[PDB]
Design a protein around this ligand. Structure first.
Ligand SMILES: NC(=O)C1=CN([C@@H]2O[C@H](COP(=O)(O)OP(=O)(O)OC[C@H]3O[C@@H](n4cnc5c(N)ncnc54)[C@H](OP(=O)(O)O)[C@@H]3O)[C@@H](O)[C@H]2O)C=CC1
Ligand code: SF4
Ligand code: SF4
Ligand code: SF4
Lengths: 208, 287, 53, 80, 156, 114, 176
C-alpha cells in the first residue's frame, strides 16, 4: 500500500476535526454539517440565512482569518427540492487551509448576496445569475455576462440540453444574421458507459 | 422515383427537402434570392456559371455543407449544358443582359439559349421547367429586348409545352435597376402609370409554385399593389431620399394588366407593398 | 471537481486568475487615461480564453 | 384658456386620436375598461398617453385609481 | 490576335500585382492567434512574401479568421467583414473555425465560419502548424494565379 | 412551509410594477427604433411588445411575476444602452420564416410532426 | 525564501546624482539600447527559406491520419470501434460489416477533419496500429466538401506511403 499510493497525515485530519467542531459549536444557529474528507479539506454545510453572518465571522476573528475568496457555483442536483448548491471556497493567507462553505438553496428564493463582505464576489454572483438564475437581492448590478444578450435559457442547468435551441446563420434575404431552431449536422452520440458491478463497496447506499 | 428526393423531417439547413434544381443564371439578382430561399427550404442547387469564381464565391455559403454545387456552362455547346442537366429534378431559366454586348444581341440569348437547353431538357426528361419572361414582351415595337423575349416566349411555349412561363412586373429591391437609376439621376419627366412589385414576394411565389405540383402549364403574371403614375413615384423617391436610353424607354413603354392569366392569388402569398420596403431600402442618402 | 461514482465527472469548474484579475478593473483604473488602461490590461497577463470559464 | 371644459375637449379628441377605442362613446360614467372592452394594459397606455399629451407625470398609484374618462378629467382638474 | 494577347499579358501583370504583396489583417480570437504570431516570428517569415502583418481593417487584402467564432462574436465579425474593399479573400484557419471543431456540439458556437463569411482557403490543425499555414497561403497565391477576370471581361 | 418571496405580497404590487415596466417599454420603443436605424413601423413593434406581454398573462404565482419583471427590466436596460446590436433587436422579431402553422393536414404532408 | 526588488534609494553623493543628471540631460542609455539593437543588426538572422527548407520536427509528429496494412496483406483495421469510442470530438464514424470471407471488417470509416483536434488518442487506442497520425501536414483545401475523409481516401493516403510511417514507428515503437 506504501509505494505508488499517496500516504496522508492524520495530524491535519485531527486539526481540521477539532477546528470544525469548534466553528460548529460557536455558530450553532446555522450549522447542520461539518464534514471532513480523508485528505483533510474542510466542508461546512449551511442553511441559507447565515450567509452574511457566517462569512462576517469567517473573514475575521483571528482564529480563522480566510480573506481569500474563490468559486461560488451551485452544483445542479435534481432529486432534491432545494436544487442548487452555492459553494463558497475560502483560503486563509495566515493558516494555509481551504474550507468549502456549502450553502444550499432552491430555484426561486435568493441567498443574501455575499458581495457586501467580498468584493471578489461581484462577477461571481453575476456569473451565477447568468448561468442559472439564482437571484441575489441587495446587489449593485445584475446583468448577463458570459452569455449572449438576446439568448436566454440559463444554460448550465441540466434542463438546458447540450446543443442550444437557437443557431445563427447569415442570410442575404434581410441582409443580416438571424437565429433558427437548431439543425444539427450530426447526432452527438451518447455512450451508455455507466457499467454495473459496484466498483466501490464502501459508498453503497441502502436500497428499498 | 428514388429516395433522397423525398422530403425528410422539418425544414432548413440540410434537411433533405424535395427539389433538386438546376439553375441557369443565379449570379445575377433574382436567381441569387431564389437560391437563398431554396437554401432556407434546404434544396440542393446545381448552378453553372461562366465568370470568375469570385462572384459565385461571395454567393457560395448560402447553402449548408456541400449542398449547392458549382460547374461551368457556355452559350455555345450542348455537351456542357447537357452534362450540367444530366440529373435534375427541376430547371429554371433566368438570363439576360439589358444591353447588347460585342458577342450577344438581345437576339440569340433570348432566342438561342432556351432552344438548346429545352432541346437537351426534353431529350433529358426534366420536369417543372420554369422560364422567366419580362412582362408585356410583345411582337410590337420599341424594343429588340421585348420582341426577342416574345420570340423566346413562343419558343418555350411551343417546344416543351408544359413549362411554367412566369412573368413578374418590373421588380424593385436592394439591387433594383430602375430605383438605382432614380438615384443615378441628372433631368426628364414623362407620364406612365406603373405598378411596382417587390422582389421577395416574387421569389417566394417562384419557390412555392416550383415546390407545389399540379399548378403546371399555366403562365403567371405578378402584380404590383399600387399601380399609379411614374412621375408621382419619382417624387415619392426623392421625398423618401431627402434630396430634391433603352432603360428609360423600356420603363416608359408598357405597364398593364393581362386579364387572361392567373397571378398571385393562386399561390397564397401576402403582397408586400411599395411603401414599407421602399422606406426599408432607401438608405444611402445624406446622414 | 464533483464526482459521482462514475467515469463521467458530474461537475467540473475552474477558478481562473484571468477572471479574478479582470474582476477589479474599475478600482484599479479609477484615476488614469485610456493608454494606461491598455497598459493595465497588459500588466495583468490575459489570454481571454481562461477568463471564460 | 385653462378651464375644465377646454381640458375635457382636448382629452376628448385625444380619446378620438387613440386607435383601438371603438367608438369613443364618451360619458361622465363611461368606464372604458370593462363597459367598452379594454385592458389594464390599455388603461396604462391611455394614462401615460394623456401624460404624453399635456403635462404632469401621473405616477403609478394614481394611474391605477382612474379606470374612467371623467375621473381622469377631474383628476387632472385636481392636479393641473 | 494580339488584342487577346495584350489582354492575357495585362491580366498576368495585374494579378501578379495583387498576389505579390497581400497584406492581411489578423483577426485572431484564440490560440490559433498565438500560432499565427509564431509564423510572424523570425523563423517562419512573412516579409519574404510581401506579407505585412497589420491590424488595419480598411486596407485588408485577405483576412485570416482564426480562433473560435461565437454567437456573441458573429455580428461584429461580419461588420468587420463589411468595411473592407471588395477584392478580398478569406483564410479559415483552424479546426475550431472551419467546421465548429472541438467545440462543435455546443451552444454559443456557430458551426464553422462558413456560416458567416465565404471561405476561400480552409487550413486545418489545432493549431495549424505555422509551416502548414504558410503552405496554405502559398496555395492561396496559386488560386490568385488562376483567376482570369480580364479574360472574362474581354470575351464578355 | 416557509417561502421568502422577492417583492410581492399580493398581485397588486405585481400589477403595479408590471404596468410601470410596460410604460418603460412604451417610451423605450421609438428611441430605439430611431437609434438602430431600424426599418419597422412603430405600430408593429409596439404591438409585438404588447403581444409578448399578453403571452404570459396566464401565471398568477407572484414569485414568477417578480422574476419576469426583473428579466424584462434587464433587457430594457440592455437595449436602452447600445449594448445589444441590430441583430438581437431584429432577433426579437421574426421576419424570416418560420412558416409552420398548426393545421393538421399541413403537418400531415410534411411528415412526422405531431 | 524571498528575494525582492526595488529596495534602494537614489544616492545623495555628488558623483551619483550628477550621473543621473547626466543621463537625464544627455540621452545616454537610450543610445545604449541603440547599441544593443545594432549588435543584433550585425548578426546573421535565423530564417528558413520555407518552400525549399523545411523546419525541423520529431519522429512523433501528428499529421495526416493515414492507415496501414499488413505485409502484402489486407486492411489492418478490424473495425473494433475503439477510436470512435475515444474520439474526443467523435469525428470518427465507423459502421462495420463482415464480408463474404468471414473476417470482421467495416463498411464506413469516416474522419471529419473539422472536428478532429489531432489528439493522438486514436493512435494510442488502436490495438493493431490501424490508424496512424501521418507525417505530413499540408491540407490547404479550397473547398469544405473536400475535408471529409472516406475510408478509400485513407487507404489511398496509406498507400501513397507507408515507408515514412514504417520508419517512424520502427524507430519509436519502443517508447510507446
Ligand atoms: N425589373 C427587372 O429587372 C426584371 C427582370 N426580369 C428578368 O429577370 C432576369 C434576371 O434579371 P437580372 O438579375 O436583373 O439581370 P442579370 O443580368 O443580372 O441576370 C442575368 C444573369 O445571367 C448571366 N448572363 C446573361 N447573359 C449571359 C451570357 N450571354 N452568358 C453567360 N451568362 C449570361 C448574367 O451575368 P454573368 O454571365 O456575369 O453571370 C447574370 O448572372 C432577366 O432575364 C430579366 O429580363 C423580369 C422581370 C423584371
Ligand atoms: S483549433 Fe485549437 S489552436 Fe485553434 S483556436 Fe481552436 S483550440 Fe485553439
Ligand atoms: S481502434 Fe484501430 S482497429 Fe480498432 S476500429 Fe479504430 S482504427 Fe480500426
Ligand atoms: S486525433 Fe483525436 S479527434 Fe482526431 S480522430 Fe483521433 S481521437 Fe478523434
Amino acid at each position: 500500500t506504501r509505494p505508488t499510493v499517496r500516504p496522508r497525515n492524520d495530524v491535519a485530519h485531527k486539526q481540521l476535526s477539532a477546528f470544525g467542531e469548534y466553528v460548529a459549536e460557536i455558530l450553532p444557529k446555522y450549522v447542520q454539517q461539518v464534514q471532513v474528507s480523508c485528505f483533510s479539506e474542510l466542508e461546512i454545510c449551511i442553511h441559507p440565512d447565515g450567509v452574511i453572518p457566517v462569512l462576517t465571522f469567517l473573514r475575521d476573528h483571528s482564529n480563522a482569518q480566510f480573506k481569500s475568496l474563490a468559486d461560488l457555483t451551485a452544483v445542479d442536483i435534481p432529486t432534491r427540492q432545494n436544487r442548487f448548491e452555492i459553494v463558497y471556497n475560502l483560503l486563509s493567507l495566515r493558516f494555509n487551509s481551504r474550507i468549502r462553505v456549502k450553502t444550499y438553496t432552491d430555484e426561486l428564493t435568493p441567498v443574501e448576496s455575499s458581495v457586501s463582505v467580498y468584493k471578489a464576489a461581484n462577477w461571481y454572483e453575476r456569473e451565477i445569475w447568468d448561468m442559472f438564475g439564482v437571484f441575489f437581492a441587495n446587489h449593485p448590478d445584475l446583468r448577463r455576462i458570459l452569455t449572449d444578450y438576446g439568448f436566454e435559457g440559463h444554460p448550465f442547468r441540466k434542463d438546458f440540453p447540450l446543443s442550444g435551441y437557437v443557431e445563427l446563420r447569415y442570410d442575404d434575404e434581410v441582409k443580416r444574421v438571424v437565429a433558427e431552431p437548431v439543425e444539427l449536422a450530426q447526432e452527438f452520440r451518447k455512450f451508455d458507459l455507466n457499467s454495473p458491478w459496484e466498483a466501490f463497496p464502501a459508498y453503497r447506499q441502502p436500497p428499498e | 422515383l428514388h429516395h433522397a428526393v423525398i422530403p425528410h423531417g422539418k425544414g432548413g439547413r440540410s434537411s433533405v427537402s424535395g427539389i433538386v434544381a438546376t439553375v441557369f443564371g443565379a449570379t445575377g439578382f433574382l436567381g441569387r434570392y431564389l437560391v437563398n430561399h431554396l437554401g432556407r427550404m434546404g434544396s440542393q442547387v446545381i448552378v453553372p456559371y461562366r465568370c470568375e469564381p469570385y462572384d459565385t464565391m461571395h454567393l457560395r455559403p448560402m447553402g449548408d455543407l456541400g449542398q449547392i454545387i458549382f460547374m461551368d456552362w457556355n452559350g455555345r455547346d450542348k455537351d456542357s449544358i447537357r452534362r450540367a442537366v444530366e440529373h435534375s429534378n427541376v430547371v429554371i431559366n433566368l438570363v439576360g443582359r439589358e444591353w447588347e454586348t460585342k458577342n450577344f444581341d438581345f437576339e440569340d440569348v433570348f432566342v438561342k439559349i432556351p432552344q438548346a437547353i429545352a432541346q437537351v431538357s426534353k431529350e433529358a426528361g426534366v420536369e417543372k421547367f420554369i422560364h422567366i419572361s419580362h412582362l408585356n414582351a410583345d411582337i410590337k415595337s420599341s424594343s429588340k429586348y421585348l420582341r426577342n423575349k416574345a420570340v423566346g416566349e413562343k419558343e418555350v411555349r411551343e417546344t416543351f409545352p408544359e413549362a411554367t412561363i412566369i412573368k413578374p412586373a418590373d421588380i424593385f429591391g436592394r439591387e433594383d435597376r430602375f430605383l438605382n437609376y432614380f438615384a443615378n439621376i441628372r433631368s426628364l419627366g414623362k407620364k406612365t402609370v406603373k405598378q411596382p412589385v417587390y422582389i421577395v414576394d416574387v421569389t417566394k411565389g417562384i419557390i412555392n409554385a416550383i415546390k407545389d405540383p399540379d399548378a403546371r402549364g399555366k403562365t403567371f403574371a405578378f402584380v404590383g399593389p399600387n399601380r399609379y403614375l411614374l412621375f408621382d413615384l419619382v417624387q415619392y423617391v426623392f421625398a423618401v431620399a431627402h434630396r430634391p436610353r433603352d432603360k428609360v424607354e423600356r420603363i416608359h413603354t408598357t405597364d398593364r394588366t393581362l386579364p387572361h392569366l392567373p397571378g398571385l392569388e393562386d399561390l397564397g402569398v401576402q403582397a408586400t407593398p411599395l411603401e414599407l420596403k421602399a422606406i426599408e431600402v432607401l438608405r444611402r442618402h445624406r446622414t | 471537481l464533483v464526482s459521482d461514482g462514475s467515469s463521467r465527472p458530474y461537475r467540473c469548474k475552474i477558478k481562473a486568475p484571468g477572471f479574478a484579475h479582470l474582476a477589479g478593473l474599475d478600482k484599479m483604473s479609477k484615476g488614469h487615461m485610456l493608454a494606461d488602461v491598455v497598459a493595465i490590461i497588459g500588466t495583468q497577463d490575459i489570454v481571454f480564453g481562461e477568463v471564460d470559464r | 384658456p385653462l378651464t375644465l371644459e377646454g381640458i375635457k375637449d382636448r382629452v376628448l379628441y385625444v380619446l378620438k386620436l387613440y386607435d383601438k377605442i371603438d367608438p369613443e362613446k364618451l360619458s361622465v360614467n363611461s368606464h372604458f375598461m370593462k363597459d367598452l372592452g379594454l385592458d389594464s394594459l390599455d388603461q396604462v397606455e391611455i394614462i401615460m398617453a394623456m401624460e404624453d399629451e399635456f403635462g404632469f407625470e401621473i405616477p403609478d398609484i394614481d394611474a391605477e385609481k382612474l379606470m374612467c374618462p371623467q375621473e381622469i378629467v377631474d383628476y387632472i382638474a385636481d392636479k393641473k | 490576335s494580339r488584342g487577346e494577347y495584350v489582354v492575357a499579358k495585362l491580366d498576368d501583370l495585374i494579378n501578379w500585382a495583387r498576389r505579390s504583396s497581400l497584406w492581411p489583417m489578423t483577426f485572431g480570437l484564440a490560440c490559433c492567434a498565438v500560432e499565427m504570431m509564431h509564423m510572424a516570428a523570425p523563423r517562419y517569415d512573412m516579409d519574404r512574401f510581401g506579407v505585412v502583418f497589420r491590424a488595419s481593417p480598411r486596407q485588408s487584402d485577405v483576412m485570416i479568421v482564426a480562433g473560435t467564432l461565437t454567437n456573441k462574436m458573429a455580428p461584429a465579425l461580419r461588420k468587420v467583414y463589411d468595411q473592407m474593399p471588395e477584392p478580398r479573400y478569406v483564410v479559415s484557419m483552424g479546426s475550431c473555425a472551419n467546421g465548429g471543431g472541438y467545440y462543435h456540439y455546443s451552444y454559443s458556437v456557430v458551426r464553422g465560419c462558413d456560416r458567416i463569411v465565404p471561405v476561400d482557403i480552409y487550413v486545418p490543425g489545432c493549431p495549424p502548424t505555422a509551416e502548414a499555414l504558410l503552405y496554405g497561403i502559398l496555395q492561396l497565391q496559386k488560386k490568385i494565379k488562376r483567376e482570369k477576370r480580364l479574360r472574362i471581361w474581354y470575351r464578355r | 412551509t416557509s417561502v421568502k418571496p422577492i417583492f410581492s405580497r399580493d398581485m397588486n404590487e405585481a400589477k403595479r410594477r408590471v404596468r410601470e415596466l410596460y410604460r418603460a417599454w412604451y417610451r423605450e420603443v421609438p428611441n430605439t427604433v430611431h437609434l438602430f436605424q431600424l426599418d419597422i413601423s412603430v405600430k408593429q413593434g409596439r404591438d409585438k411588445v404588447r403581444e409578448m406581454f399578453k403571452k404570459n398573462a396566464h401565471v398568477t404565482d407572484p414569485r414568477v411575476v417578480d422574476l419576469l419583471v426583473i428579466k424584462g427590466k434587464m433587457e430594457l436596460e440592455e437595449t436602452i444602452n447600445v449594448w445589444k446590436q441590430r441583430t438581437h433587436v431584429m432577433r426579437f422579431f421574426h421576419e424570416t420564416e418560420a412558416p409552420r402553422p398548426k393545421d393538421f393536414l399541413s403537418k400531415f404532408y410534411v411528415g412526422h410532426d405531431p | 525564501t524571498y528575494k525582492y526588488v526595488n529596495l534602494r534609494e537614489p544616492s545623495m553623493d555628488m558623483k551619483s546624482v550628477t550621473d543621473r543628471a547626466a543621463q537625464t540631460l544627455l540621452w545616454t542609455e537610450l543610445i545604449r539600447g541603440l547599441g544593443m539593437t545594432l549588435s543584433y543588426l550585425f548578426r546573421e538572422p535565423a530564417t528558413i527559406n520555407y518552400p525549399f527548407e523545411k523546419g525541423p520536427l520529431s519522429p512523433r509528429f501528428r499529421g495526416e491520419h493515414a492507415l496501414r496494412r499488413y505485409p502484402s496483406g489486407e486492411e489492418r483495421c478490424i473495425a473494433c470501434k475503439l477510436c470512435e469510442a475515444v474520439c474526443p470530438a467523435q469525428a470518427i464514424t465507423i459502421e462495420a460489416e463482415p464480408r463474404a470471407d468471414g473476417s470482421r471488417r467495416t463498411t464506413r470509416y469516416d474522419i471529419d477533419m473539422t472536428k478532429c483536434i489531432y489528439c493522438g488518442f486514436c493512435q494510442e487506442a488502436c490495438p493493431v496500429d490501424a490508424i496512424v497520425e501521418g507525417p505530413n501536414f499540408e491540407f490547404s483545401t479550397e473547398t469544405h466538401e473536400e475535408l471529409l475523409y472516406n475510408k478509400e481516401k485513407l487507404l489511398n493516403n496509406g498507400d501513397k506511403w507507408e515507408a515514412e510511417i514504417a520508419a517512424n514507428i520502427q524507430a519509436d515503437y519502443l517508447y510507446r
